[PDB]
């Protein structure tokens, strides 16, 4: 299955941090934000990935991540010249997607939980239908909202919201999504809305929802406060539980994409902080 990271634009809410730095390059503890959604595609077993960003950001992401060969994956880049809605991902990515299934993750979304990888790996391995991920939030109505029983409805930012399950920024689709995205009508405000893509699979009876309740984290990166809360969570998990979240090199290595010697070479030009040292130890034993 292929994957797309869509970043994302902005963000103004984070000014002045985002005056001269892309939101998705801001730290979340010790890693650029975009490491987090990338790691989620990687943990899903997705290895062919298109990163879509603004014309201004695209070169910076490419500088950060290159073509992915150090991680044993393949990264490509495209531009979204105007922010016309998330579903543009599948028009912009039409050629890259080809005949394949494809997952889309938003560049500012952070997921974490034991048993998450299982859910990702299961969604990636579904050859038919769409899988979305629901999260209990206090603020339903500034998200897409999913009502269930098994899915009964989905609405984008419903002023009367029929549940407190936000539809998170992670979606897995079969190849029909390309044609679906083409047949969406733009919303008031000329956006091609992902929630219409999800309504199309609902109508087919083939929208599957994974509800991440107990044991799962989905972190808000939208404000100075929530961005620091995210960094503290990551540091706290990492320090108290001796584990790394979205350490791309560790994941490439655990998934069998890269060898012991290749991991050591990733730690050789960087043998210093607690990042590199996690890696070079990992590589021994």
Describe it.
Helix 10 runs antiparallel to helix 11. The chain has a single domain, classed as Alpha-Beta Complex (Spore Coat Polysaccharide Biosynthesis Protein SpsA, Chain A), CATH 3.90.550.10. It is globular and about 50 Å long. It is of the alpha/beta class and 285 residues long.
Describe this protein with a few key phrases:
285 residues; alpha/beta; Spore Coat Polysaccharide Biosynthesis Protein SpsA, Chain A; 7-stranded mixed β-sheet; two-stranded antiparallel sheet; globular; transferase; thymidylyltransferase; nucleotide binding; monomeric
Helix content: 25-40%
SSE arrangement, N to C: EEEHEHEHHEEHEEEEHHEEHHHH
Q: DSSP helix count? A: 11
Most strands sheet: 7 strands, mixed
Integer tally of domains: 1
In angstroms, what is the radius of gyration? 18 Å
Strand order, sheet with most strands: 5-4-1-6-11-8-12
* Proportion of residues in extended strands: 15-25%
Structural class: alpha/beta
CATH superfamily: Spore Coat Polysaccharide Biosynthesis Protein SpsA, Chain A
CATH architecture: Alpha-Beta Complex
Q: Compute the separation of the termini in Å.
A: 32 Å
CATH names the topology as Spore Coat Polysaccharide Biosynthesis Protein SpsA, Chain A
Q: What oligomerization state is this entry in?
A: monomer
The CATH class is identified as Alpha Beta
Instruction: Tell the overall outline.
Output: globular
């Amino acid at each position: 299955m292929k994957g797309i990271i869509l970043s994302g634009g902005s963000g103004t809410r984070l000014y002045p941090l985002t005056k001269v730095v892309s939101k998705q390059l801001l730290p979340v503890y010790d890693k650029p934000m975009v490491y987090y959604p990338l790691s989620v595609l990687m943990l899903a077993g997705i290895k062919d990935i298109l990163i879509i960003s603004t014309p201004e950001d695209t070169p910076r992401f490419e500088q950060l991540l290159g073509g992915g060969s150090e991680l044993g994956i393949s990264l490509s880049y495209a531009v979204q010249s105007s922010p016309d809605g998330l579903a543009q991902a599948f028009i912009i990515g039409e050629e890259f997607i080809g005949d394949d299934n494809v997952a889309l993750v938003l560049g500012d979304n952070i997921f974490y939980g034991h048993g998450f990888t299982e859910l990702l790996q299961r969604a990636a391995n579904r050859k038919s239908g769409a899988t979305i991920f629901g999260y209990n939030v206090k603020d339903p109505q500034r998200f897409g909202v999913v009502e269930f029983d098994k899915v009964i409805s989905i609405e984008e930012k419903p002023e009367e919201p029929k549940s407190s399950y936000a539809v998170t920024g992670l979606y897995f689709y079969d190849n029909r999504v390309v044609d679906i995205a083409k047949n969406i009508t733009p919303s008031a405000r000329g956006e091609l809305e992902i929630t219409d893509v999800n309504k199309a699979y609902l109508e087919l009876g083939e929208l599957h929802v994974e509800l991440l309740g107990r044991g799962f984290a989905w972190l808000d990166t939208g404000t100075h406060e929530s961005l620091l809360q995210a960094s503290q969570f990551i540091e706290t998990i990492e320090k108290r539980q001796s584990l790394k979240v979205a350490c791309l090199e560790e994941i490439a290595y655990r998934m069998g994409y890269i060898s012991r010697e290749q991991l050591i070479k990733l730690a050789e030009p960087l043998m210093k902080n607690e990042y590199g040292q996690y890696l070079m130890n990992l590589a021994h034993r």
